[PDB]
Design an enzyme around this catalytic site. Structure first.
Site, PDB file in Angstrom:
ATOM      1  N   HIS A  46      29.092  19.661  24.739  1.00 36.76           N
ATOM      2  CA  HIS A  46      28.460  20.489  25.777  1.00 36.76           C
ATOM      3  C   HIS A  46      28.294  19.793  27.111  1.00 36.76           C
ATOM      4  O   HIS A  46      28.382  18.573  27.208  1.00 36.76           O
ATOM      5  CB  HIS A  46      27.034  20.918  25.384  1.00 36.76           C
ATOM      6  CG  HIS A  46      26.823  21.115  23.919  1.00 36.76           C
ATOM      7  ND1 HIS A  46      26.164  20.191  23.135  1.00 36.76           N
ATOM      8  CD2 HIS A  46      27.205  22.115  23.091  1.00 36.76           C
ATOM      9  CE1 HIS A  46      26.157  20.615  21.881  1.00 36.76           C
ATOM     10  NE2 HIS A  46      26.783  21.776  21.830  1.00 36.76           N
ATOM     11  N   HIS A  71      20.950  28.976  23.005  1.00 34.01           N
ATOM     12  CA  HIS A  71      22.166  28.256  22.647  1.00 34.01           C
ATOM     13  C   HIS A  71      23.070  29.152  21.787  1.00 34.01           C
ATOM     14  O   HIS A  71      22.579  29.800  20.859  1.00 34.01           O
ATOM     15  CB  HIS A  71      21.777  27.006  21.856  1.00 34.01           C
ATOM     16  CG  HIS A  71      22.946  26.233  21.354  1.00 34.01           C
ATOM     17  ND1 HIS A  71      23.666  25.374  22.156  1.00 34.01           N
ATOM     18  CD2 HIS A  71      23.574  26.259  20.158  1.00 34.01           C
ATOM     19  CE1 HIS A  71      24.700  24.915  21.471  1.00 34.01           C
ATOM     20  NE2 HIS A  71      24.666  25.441  20.261  1.00 34.01           N
TER      21      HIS A  71
END
Ligand SMILES: [Cu+2]
Ligand SMILES: [Cu+2]
Ligand SMILES: [Zn+2]
Ligand SMILES: [Zn+2]
Lengths: 153, 153
Positions: A46, A71
């Site tokens: 990420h 998320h």
């Protein structure tokens, strides 16, 4: 526009992540090569909020999430801008590949230039876990390597 | 707005450079702490064009110079945006200090976020040397350490 992050750490993991975006509204092409990972696995990948390397990979902060969403997987509508899911590693612990993304940008108010890329030691559950933590980090675990995203050509 | 660059290299030189700018038109405050330099000396210090760490400090490219001016001292009207002159080192090889600059910015089209900071092994002649090279690099020499400038808080 081109950008790049050199992933480094003290855990045997290292690599390079390249970014390319023609214009703000267009997808950004993310390509990566990462070595030293567990073999035959899936590892969280990420863009984190800060390009701060003063405290290992800890100072990169949380997943880049300007829109304050939970998320998720890269293909989910509800995800953090920085959510790049899992990268698959081969029998030698190498993760190599590329993909296009329309939330990640190198141009505009959400630009990731100056932020960080983090490769995790665990698998990202894509926000589908039974926890509040799943909706924050995907339970991806430790951050063996990371790098600040810089502008290049 | 706050930014930071962690200077690393294989030459014994390392450090941290912090940047702070309130708004685009205001001066950016640059503060630094760098260890491992030659003692009792003056060392070239600048912002280079690219935040590319794929090839040591070489890939940082040239001094950031969007206005295509010659290399100069920070107080010269004619200088590269990235020209931060020389930093003085003490008897222990430490350079520590802070200054304000009106060309260096963390906001706008000339933002240095995503670029690099380079600390040199030699003294910057401030563009006052007898050479074409003086007007390019200030004859500051090698780049023992460098770091990509990332956004922080
Ligand atoms: Cu992460
Ligand atoms: Cu320089
Ligand atoms: Zn996330
Ligand atoms: Zn210069």
């Amino acid at each position: 526009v081109q950008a790049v992050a050199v992933l480094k750490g003290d855990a045997g993991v290292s690599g390079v992540v390249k970014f390319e975006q023609a214009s703000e509204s267009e997808p950004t092409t993310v390509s990566y090569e990462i070595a030293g990972n567990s073999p035959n696995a899936e590892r969280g990948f990420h863009i984190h909020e800060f390009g701060d390397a003063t405290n290992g990979c800890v100072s990169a902060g949380p997943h880049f999430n300007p829109f304050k969403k939970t998320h998720g997987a890269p293909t989910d509508e509800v995800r953090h801008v920085g959510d790049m899911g899992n990268v698959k590693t081969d029998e030698n612990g190498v993760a190599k590949g590329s993909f296009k993304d329309s939330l990640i940008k190198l141009i505009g108010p959400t630009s990731v230039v100056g932020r960080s890329v983090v490769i995790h030691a665990g698998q990202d559950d894509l926000g589908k876990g039974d926890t509040e933590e799943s909706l924050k980090t995907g339970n991806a675990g430790p951050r063996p390597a990371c790098g600040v995203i810089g502008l290049t050509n």
